[PDB]
Amino acid sequence: RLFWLLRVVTSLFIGAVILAVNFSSEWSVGHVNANTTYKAFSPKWVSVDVGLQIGLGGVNITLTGTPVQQLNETINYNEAFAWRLGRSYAEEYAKALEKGLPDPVLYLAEKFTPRSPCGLYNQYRLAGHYASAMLWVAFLCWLLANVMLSMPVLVYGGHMLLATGLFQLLALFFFSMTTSLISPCPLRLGTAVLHTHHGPAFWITLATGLLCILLGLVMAVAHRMQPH
């Protein structure tokens, strides 16, 4: 039975990775440890580590200090600003600007607002909307390929296993057109820069898509040359 367990666990991993990647905010990940101003009404500079995470539906600015007790305080922030078709980014930024978040968090939150010189809103709101529907299509295809892993002829299941990885790669391609404009947009925090590059949830999807394409090609070759 050692083969059937693997044949089930592989499909389970594919489905779980589609579901997890479609909701994980680690597509583009940047990080830096700089000296920045803390907040208003205080000339005191703190030493923190600022990093953002773009996840097809919003960002996560995380400003935490090198120590977690800097100025009779404790600095561990993790705020989210969502631009997906449900919520609004402008209202979230305008409601966070009243609460008095630390200055670099508001800085990095401003960059993605609508009608900003950099313009990182109308190219991210479309990527996180197309590369996120081409991960639901690549899940419907996975369900159908699992249903065709039974009494129905298995060559159609193999074709749908091709389609799963094909749609995964077609989704991963749409989050590649959002690197030509995030690189020009400067993110100079104090005296340090904050570079963003494709994160884990962009490589794991590539690996899963390649695995699905290879499995499909092998199934096609097998059922075309040796019906075993």
Partner 1 sequence: QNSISWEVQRFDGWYNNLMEHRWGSKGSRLQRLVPASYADGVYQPLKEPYLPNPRHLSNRVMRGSAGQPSLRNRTVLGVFFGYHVLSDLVSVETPGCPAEFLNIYIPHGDPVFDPDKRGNVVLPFQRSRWDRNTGQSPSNPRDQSNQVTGWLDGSAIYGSSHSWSDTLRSFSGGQLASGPDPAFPSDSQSSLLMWMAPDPSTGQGGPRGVYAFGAQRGNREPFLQALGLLWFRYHNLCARKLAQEHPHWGDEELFQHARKRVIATYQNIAMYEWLPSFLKQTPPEYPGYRPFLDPSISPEFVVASEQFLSTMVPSGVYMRNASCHFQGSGALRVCNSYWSREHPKLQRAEDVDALLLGMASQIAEREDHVVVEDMQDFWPGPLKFSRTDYLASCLQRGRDLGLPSYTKAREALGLSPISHWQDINPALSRSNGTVLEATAALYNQDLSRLELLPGGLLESHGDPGPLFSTIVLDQFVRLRDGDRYWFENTRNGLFSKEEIAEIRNTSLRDILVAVTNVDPSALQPNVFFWLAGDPCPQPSQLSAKGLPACAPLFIRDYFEGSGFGFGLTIGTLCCFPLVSLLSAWIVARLRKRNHQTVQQFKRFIENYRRHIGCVAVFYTITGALFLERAYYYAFAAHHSGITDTTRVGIILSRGTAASISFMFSYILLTMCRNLITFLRETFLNRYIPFDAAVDFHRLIASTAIILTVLHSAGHVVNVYLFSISPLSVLSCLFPGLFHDDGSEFPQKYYWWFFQTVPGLTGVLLLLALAIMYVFASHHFRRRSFRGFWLTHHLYIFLYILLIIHGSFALIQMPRFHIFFLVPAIIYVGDKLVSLSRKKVEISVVKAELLPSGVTHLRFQRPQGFEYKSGQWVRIACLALGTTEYHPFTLTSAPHEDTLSLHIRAAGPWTTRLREIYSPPRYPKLYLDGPFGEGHQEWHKFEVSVLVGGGIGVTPFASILKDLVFKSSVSCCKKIYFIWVTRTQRQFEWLADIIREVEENDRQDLVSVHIYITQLAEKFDLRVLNRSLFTGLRSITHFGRPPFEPFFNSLQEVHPQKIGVFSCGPPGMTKNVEKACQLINRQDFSHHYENF
Ligand X SMILES: *[C@@H]1O[C@H](CO)[C@@H](O[C@@H]2O[C@H](CO)[C@@H](O[C@@H]3O[C@H](CO[C@H]4O[C@H](CO)[C@@H](O)[C@H](O[C@H]5O[C@H](CO)[C@@H](O)[C@H](O)[C@@H]5O)[C@@H]4O)[C@@H](O)[C@H](O)[C@@H]3O)[C@H](O)[C@H]2NC(C)=O)[C@H](O)[C@H]1NC(C)=O
Site residues, ligand NAG (CB under 6 A): 35, 47, 191-192
**Is residue 130 at the binding interface for ligand X, with CB under 6 A as the rule?**
no
- Tell me whether residue 31 or residue 223 sits nearer to ligand X (CB atom): 31
- Tell me whether residue 39 or residue 223 sits nearer to ligand X (CB atom): 39
Residue type, 169: L
Among 121, 149, 222, 223, binds partner 1 (CB under 8 A): 121
**Is residue 129 at the binding interface for partner 1, with CB under 8 A as the rule?**
yes
Contacts with partner 1, 22-51, as mask; x by CB under 8 A: -------------x-x--xxxx-xxx----
Q: Determine the interface stretch with partner 1 among 49-57, 59-67, 187-195, 198-206 (rule: CB under 8 A).
A: 187-195
- Residue 5's binding partner, choosing from ligand X, partner 1, ligand NAG, none, with beta-carbon cut-off 5 to 8 A by kind? none
The structure tokens 């305008």 sit at 94
CA distance 57 to 153: 39
Q: Strand (E) positions, the chain?
A: 28-30, 35-37, 45-51, 53-54, 59-65, 79-81, 196-198
Residue 207 burial (C-beta neighbours within 10 Å; 0-12, 13-18, 19+): exposed
CA distance 142 to 160: 7
Residues that bind ligand X (CB under 6 A): 25, 60, 73-80
